[PDB]
Amino acid sequence: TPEEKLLRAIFGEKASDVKDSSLRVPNGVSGTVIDVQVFTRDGVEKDKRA
């Protein structure tokens, strides 16, 4: 749409036709997250939690 540039109206980037979507996970199990490991291939920028 021309409105795909609404993003641009406040930001920019290219076009918004690309499907914006965050990898969300499925169901069936509860739990409590006890331990998180983050491994980084060398050269890549470590983020703040790594």
Partner: protein, 492 residues
Amino acid sequence: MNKEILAVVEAVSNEKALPREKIFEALESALATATKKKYEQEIDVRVQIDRKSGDFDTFRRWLVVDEVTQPTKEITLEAARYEDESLNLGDYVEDQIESVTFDRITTQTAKQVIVQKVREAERAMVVDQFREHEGEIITGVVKKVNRDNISLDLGNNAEAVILREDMLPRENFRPGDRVRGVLYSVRPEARGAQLFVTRSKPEMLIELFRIEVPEIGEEVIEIKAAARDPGSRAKIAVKTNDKRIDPVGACVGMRGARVQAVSTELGGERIDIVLWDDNPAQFVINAMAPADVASIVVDEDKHTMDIAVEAGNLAQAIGRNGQNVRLASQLSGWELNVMTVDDLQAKHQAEAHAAIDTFTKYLDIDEDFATVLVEEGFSTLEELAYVPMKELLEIEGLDEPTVEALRERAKNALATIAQAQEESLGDNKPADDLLNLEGVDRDLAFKLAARGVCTLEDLAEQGIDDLADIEGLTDEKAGALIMAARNICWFG
């Protein structure tokens, strides 16, 4: 990115004729509101957009105040000046905060605030430029028909409303129909319909005549008054200062073409066009058209006029359901009583006999002398009591001693009228039983008794509307006294 902010500001400034500054202030407020919604706590937030780069910094704003009521959004002047000595009451203290990423959420909020700013800038300036239209006959397309109103689209996101009372009684509009009407009121309902349009009020008739009659648009002919029964009949009064122009002939046009165009736009409403006269009696004769008036009697004190007509013209003078007399009365501002020549003579004979009986009873004069007073134009005891002595001395057979005695008798008769009422229920029963009503001084009791409210029961039976004309009695004070009277009479 950077140059794109400038290109957007320039495009919007040029297309909406709006100050760039007003668009930025609104984007800053939009971004501040979008930022506030990302925090779980109620924070105060200022956003500042750089006018050259389009880059923006976001703060934790702290409204500098004297007394802090909201510690999450407010800071004391003493604490603000510890960080920057230049700060005053009403300034903002900032705090380095991560600016919200411009996602399609902030983008949508920014778009909504821009649209709202354009409604309060571009559309507001369009309404200001259309000062004529705000008052003249605007044209709209019917967007929606409800039971109680019609929504019109005027273009440019402007919506108007015609209320049910503002429509003609036989009009049936459909969505997509074009409708003309006078913009009679502009309120402040930007979201929705701030514009109120009428087709029923007299202004619609005046403005249709202004458009159809060039001589009215050029101020050569003036419409002095308009009276209207919407979708049935109207009267307009026209004047001109140019003796070469017939104002009635100009408004009618060649074979009635102009008045028929206005009538057709009003759903076949019958329009009478009358000549305005500066003499009220001559103006009422003109307003009574098409009925021929035989005589007029003017009562200036009551602001009423008795209109005698021939018995054959009585039905035409009154009109269907009194429509002709009512429109003439609304056009003149006078109360108009239409009767036959025989009925007017019978009324005058009954009034003369009642005046003679009143003068004979109260002035201790003979019927012959009372008849002379009525023939010289005296009808009330008040006229005889207060009229200049010169007018009473112009009457044949009155000397200065007899005029003085007549005035003294008239004043004593007027006094005794109030005195008898007071003795019965004015300074006695109204100054005791009716004085019990909260707030009833002796003056108010006599004012009530002059209206026939002599007892506390008579006051308990009144409405607020029946007492509204009593000088010094407000609707609230009237309501309190009636309720006090009812509490004693009906609940004691």
